[PDB]
Write a protein that binds this ligand. Structure first.
Ligand SMILES: [Ca+2]
Ligand SMILES: [Ca+2]
Ligand SMILES: [Ca+2]
Length: 255
DNA sequence: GCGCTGAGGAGGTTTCTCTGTTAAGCGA
DNA sequence: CGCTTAACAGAGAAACCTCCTCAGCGCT
């Protein structure tokens, strides 16, 4: 407790799906920390807000798409509750700069739009693969980050067959270091693919990798919370039907 | 009354996620 | 051969990040 390990889960989850933003408001400035998910996670925004004790929740539907936000902008609530979290549990991607800049500005009582210095994320990495795996909270943080950015899919090759394939995938923009640390923490061997938009994309599909993914969510000191838990659990079940997996990996159903 | 504020509402954009397809590993 | 994985990657929804107007509130 204090900032009990579930607080790491959070910074992970925000790092992937959230954002620390200071925005114009005429003469004035707003400081948002917001997360904005698909409507599918209504249940979890309220979880996060329950955990945190702050922020306003809103719903939004643009064209066919229903979305939900938790948004924290009260600057007294940022100072007292949010900053000791990300100070306690700092982020691990290069978003850290977003936070640092933001904290700094907030703490200097910058209220006027024209006072605000021009900012732009350092492209330089702020961190080393090594410092990452060695990061005591990291265990916890990785559940959070997987809530946001991980993807447990199973799918069938070939279109015209019974043969399934059971996968885990995660990705970052300008996240070669971060992706590499995860990839190394879980003892993968596959290529981290690097795409046209500098997206660094991890994907594994073997039995031994998967045996490991499963291993990790199972041993990790915090559970998934949102739609992801659901996603995980169905995939588990799924894995019990494909033979290569079912025969090497302890496959519980009490997650 | 004045200056500042968070909530509310919205636009602009792109980073993912999720599900493959093709070809090559490999146990045998 | 035949079960298994590795590399590549489209596409478009689920994120990411912004700016504005408004009432209310606590100052002097
Ligand atoms: Ca994300
Ligand atoms: Ca992200
Ligand atoms: Ca997500």
């Amino acid at each position: 407790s204090h900032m009990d390990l579930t607080y790491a889960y959070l910074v992970g989850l925000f790092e992937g799906d959230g954002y620390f933003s200071i925005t114009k408001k005429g003469k004035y400035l707003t400081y948002e920390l917001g997360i904005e998910l698909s409507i599918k996670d209504v249940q979890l925004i309220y979880k996060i807000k329950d955990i945190l004790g702050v922020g306003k929740v809103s719903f939004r539907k643009r064209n066919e798409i229903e979305m939900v936000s938790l948004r924290i902008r009260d600057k007294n609530h940022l100072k007292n509750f949010i900053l000791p979290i990300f100070d306690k549990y700092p982020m691990l991607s290069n978003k850290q700069y977003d936070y640092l800049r933001f904290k700094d500005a907030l703490l200097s009582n910058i209220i006027y739009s024209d006072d605000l210095p021009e900012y732009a994320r350092s492209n330089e990495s702020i961190n080393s693969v090594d410092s990452i795996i060695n990061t005591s909270y990291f265990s916890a943080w990785l559940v959070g980050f997987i809530e946001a950015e991980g993807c447990f899919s199973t799918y069938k090759l070939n279109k015209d067959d019974d043969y399934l394939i059971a996968s885990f995938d995660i990705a970052q923009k300008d996240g070669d270091i971060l992706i590499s640390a995860i990839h190394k923490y879980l003892s993968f061997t596959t290529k981290i693919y690097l795409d046209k938009t500098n997206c660094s994309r991890l994907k594994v599909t073997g039995v031994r990798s998967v045996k490991n993914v499963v291993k990790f969510i199972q041993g990790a000191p915090v559970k998934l919370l949102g739609n992801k838990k659901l996603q995980y659990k169905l995939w588990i079940k799924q894995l019990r039907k494909i033979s290569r997996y079912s025969e090497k990996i302890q496959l519980p159903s009490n997650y």
